[PDB]
Write a protein that binds this ligand. Sequence first.
Ligand SMILES: Nc1ncnc2c1ncn2[C@@H]1O[C@H](COP(=O)(O)OP(=O)(O)OP(=O)(O)OP(=O)(O)OP(=O)(O)OC[C@H]2O[C@@H](n3cnc4c(N)ncnc43)[C@H](O)[C@@H]2O)[C@@H](O)[C@H]1O
Ligand SMILES: [Mg+2]
Length: 218
Amino acid sequence: ESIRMVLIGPPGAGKGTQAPNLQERFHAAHLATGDMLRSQIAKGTQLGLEAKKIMDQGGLVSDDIMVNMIKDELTNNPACKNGFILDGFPRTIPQAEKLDQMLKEQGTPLEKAIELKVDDELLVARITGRLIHPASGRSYHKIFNPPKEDMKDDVTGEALVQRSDDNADALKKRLAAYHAQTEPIVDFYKKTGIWAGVDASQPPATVWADILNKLGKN
Ligand SMILES: Nc1ncnc2c1ncn2[C@@H]1O[C@H](COP(=O)(O)OP(=O)(O)OP(=O)(O)OP(=O)(O)OP(=O)(O)OC[C@H]2O[C@@H](n3cnc4c(N)ncnc43)[C@H](O)[C@@H]2O)[C@@H](O)[C@H]1O
Ligand SMILES: [Mg+2]
């Protein structure tokens, strides 16, 4: 129950769905930069308000902002001493290089980078059917993964919402940004030898068993 890892995948691939599994199993901290940004928006902070406009256009928030955010969480979040699951970070080559240097100075290098590979065609249905519980970050899908109490988060009973960047127009922008900016990082980790690919087109429990097999832990 110590892992230091990155989850990489296109929008809707399943990072947020699998992260709880990894978190349970390894008692690692789940560091999800999308959720962090959405917290900023919810607190109504100036960073949150300017990030929202970029997020809804399917753009990427500045590397400087994102690196600083993660630097602080690694440094002064106690939970990141067990290990951590990075979800949505790094998202660009500069973020990947700077993370590399941060973890070198701390002497705690990444063990695995798991790519959740899934064709883009499948991603539209996942995005447009998604409901989230804003408070926990938990995602459901109207077709593929329903709440038992529909439109209600099961674990709190609290209402589910749609994400404001979860539409086909923004998603086209999101997918392009992923192929242009994020997908090069997979090669970076291939060169460092910590990459493993997973078939994220399978259903959740099957992807999870695939991830466990690929972490060398099952
Ligand atoms: N480091 C950074 N640098 C720059 N900018 C940054 C940044 N970090 C964040 N940002 C910014 O913030 C924005 C949002 O970031 P973020 O929120 O991190 O978005 P993302 O990377 O686009 O990912 P998603 O959350 O959409 O996908 P997911 O894979 O986690 O999906 P889920 O598991 O819910 O699953 C999707 C849906 O399908 C479902 N599902 C999951 N798995 C399966 C399966 N196997 N089969 C069927 N249904 C499934 C779910 O139930 C759900 O309905 C960015 O676009 C950018 O603006
Ligand atoms: Mg997510």
